[PDB]
């Protein structure tokens, strides 16, 4: 500009370029602030999972993988974190007939933990997460109501 123009007019031409490139910097910095808030929200989620998935056992659904959370192992990645989620998944279901309570001596018996099932001819108590039948006794149940 100077090489081919006098100062009175060169100040105007340089002021236009300065304004344009100063606008470029304002655009750049504004976007970095908006984008840094997003990576910060991600770092907060990763820190929360580090506490709740790795340093303990969570009951939060889908927070620590798909299935029933057992444990997790961290791995380092460039600018990030990778979680190896270990879950419990049930398989191979069978159907049974069930009932909420059993009558004996005119009294209602309810399970302490588990469900009543029938294999077709006899009834058993099972735990709810794995099929493992036991005989229904007075130490397995409690009485309430008629």
């Amino acid at each position: 500009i100077l090489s081919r123009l006098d100062p009175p007019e060169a100040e105007v031409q340089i002021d236009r370029l300065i304004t344009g490139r100063l606008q470029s910097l304002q655009t750049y910095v504004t976007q970095q602030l908006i984008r840094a808030a997003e990576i910060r929200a991600s770092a907060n989620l990763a820190a929360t999972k580090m506490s709740e998935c790795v340093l303990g056992q969570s009951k939060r659904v889908d927070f620590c993988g798909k299935g029933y959370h057992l444990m997790s192992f961290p791995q380092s990645a460039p600018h990030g974190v990778v979680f190896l989620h270990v879950t419990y998944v049930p398989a191979q279901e069978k159907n049974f007939t069930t009932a909420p309570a059993i009558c004996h001596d005119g009294k209602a018996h309810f399970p302490r933990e588990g469900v009543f099932v029938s294999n077709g001819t006899h009834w058993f108590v099972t735990q709810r997460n794995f099929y493992e039948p036991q005989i229904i006794t007075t130490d397995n149940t409690f009485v309430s109501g008629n």
Binding site: V82, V89, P90, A91
Partner: protein
């Protein structure tokens, strides 16, 4: 797509690369009519013209002026225009159009002009030095010359001093050239100031009576006045072109409307104040103005590592206004892919429930499925309990930081 991405290898997906854009055809400039033609018809047809010494003077008003009858009249001898050109009389606008008319001898028409002299132009009719009017003059031998002498038209040839421009003098005071006062009696050095052109049909050119009319414009202070006439060009419909309705300039497709203006309103606007309907000045019908057919153009590619086939989506473009397999979607017109009746998992999302895939080879595009279907075997006394299990491992990835920059 390669050029927009700056690469020679494009990964599978859908890329927005450009835009459609319907273009307008023809340029129609519409208007009304002419209403009051402001009748020049009589000042050029007055059966009894006026002698030059007492010349008539008709002033046009706010009107419609169509000079095409003058220039194209075809029967003239002299037509010279000083202020403005003879053809640009129909695109300007002036306040007061004065029209003078009289009759004079043949070889004296050279004196109705700015800055001349002679027994006629000196003191009968003086045009100024900054004239802006338009002089027309023709021969009228067969209409105003009657054998035996027609002594009606006079012309003054004695006066104290020359006239002033556009001034008028009609007196009949007896001249006085000598030194002795006249006391109003003709004779020695006391001459009558008016003579008469004695016209006859057996005269040569330069002595037969010519009729002269002059126009003169002046724009004192008026905001707007009589201007030139408007113009036409047949009105078409259902074809987004380039239109002008007496000042309203725009682009778009014209269609019959169903709005009802008030009996003083020309055009309507929508919310946000953009014109969306006009009234045709001539036929008085309301027409809607819709925008043409512009929109983005996207390219659907299976990936350059799979094939070089491609389909193109014109976003919200009707399939009749695009310029095989043409498929209409709520997102636009898809060309180059087929529409199947099966339903798959979505691969490349198009929109409004439509996806594309590279399966069945050219390129197709069906509906979207929703996954497998399954009924649970519910009853009022049945339960399902697992007898075995597996241990699963799954990954989850989260970003934690960016590069730190400084400018």
């Amino acid at each position: 797509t390669k050029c927009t991405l700056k690469s020679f290898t494009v990964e599978k997906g859908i890329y927005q690369t450009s835009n459609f854009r319907v273009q307008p055809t023809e340029s129609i400039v519409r208007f009304p009519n002419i209403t009051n033609l402001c009748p020049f018809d009589e000042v050029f047809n007055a059966t009894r013209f006026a002698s030059v010494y007492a010349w008539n003077r008709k002033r046009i008003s706010n009107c419609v002026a169509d000079y095409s009858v003058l220039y194209n009249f075809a029967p003239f001898f002299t037509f010279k225009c000083y202020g403005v050109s003879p053809t640009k009389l129909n695109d300007l606008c002036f306040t007061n159009v004065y029209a003078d008319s009289f009759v004079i001898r043949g070889n004296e028409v050279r004196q109705i002009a700015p800055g001349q002299t002679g027994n006629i132009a000196d003191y009968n009719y003086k045009l100024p030095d900054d004239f802006t009017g338009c002089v027309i003059a023709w021969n009228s031998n067969k209409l105003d010359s009657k054998v035996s002498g027609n002594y009606n038209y006079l012309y003054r040839l004695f006066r104290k001093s020359n006239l002033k421009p556009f001034e008028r003098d009609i007196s009949t005071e007896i001249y006085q050239a000598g030194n002795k006062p006249c006391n109003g009696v003709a004779g020695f050095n006391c001459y009558f100031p008016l003579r008469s052109y004695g016209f006859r049909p057996t005269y040569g050119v330069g002595h037969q009576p010519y009729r002269v009319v002059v126009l003169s414009f002046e724009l004192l202070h008026a905001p707007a006045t009589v201007c030139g006439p408007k113009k036409s060009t047949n009105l078409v419909k259902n074809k987004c072109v380039n239109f002008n309705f007496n000042g309203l300039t725009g682009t778009g497709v014209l269609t019959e409307s169903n709005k009802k203006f008030l009996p003083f309103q020309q055009f309507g606007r929508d919310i946000a104040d953009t014109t969306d309907a006009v009234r045709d000045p001539q036929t008085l019908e309301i027409l809607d103005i819709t925008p043409c057919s512009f929109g983005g153009v996207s390219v659907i590619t299976p990936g350059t590592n799979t094939s070089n086939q491609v389909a193109v989506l014109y976003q919200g473009v009707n399939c009749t206004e695009v310029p095989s397999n043409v498929f209409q979607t709520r997102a636009g017109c898809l060309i180059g892919a087929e529409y199947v009746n099966n339903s798959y998992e979505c691969d490349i999302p198009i929109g409004a429930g439509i996806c594309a895939s590279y399966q069945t080879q050219s390129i197709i595009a069906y509906t979207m499925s929703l996954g497998a279907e399954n009924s649970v075997a519910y009853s009022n006394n049945s339960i399902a309990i697992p007898t075995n299990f597996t241990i699963s491992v799954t990954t989850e990835i989260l970003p934690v930081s960016m590069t730190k920059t400084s400018v």
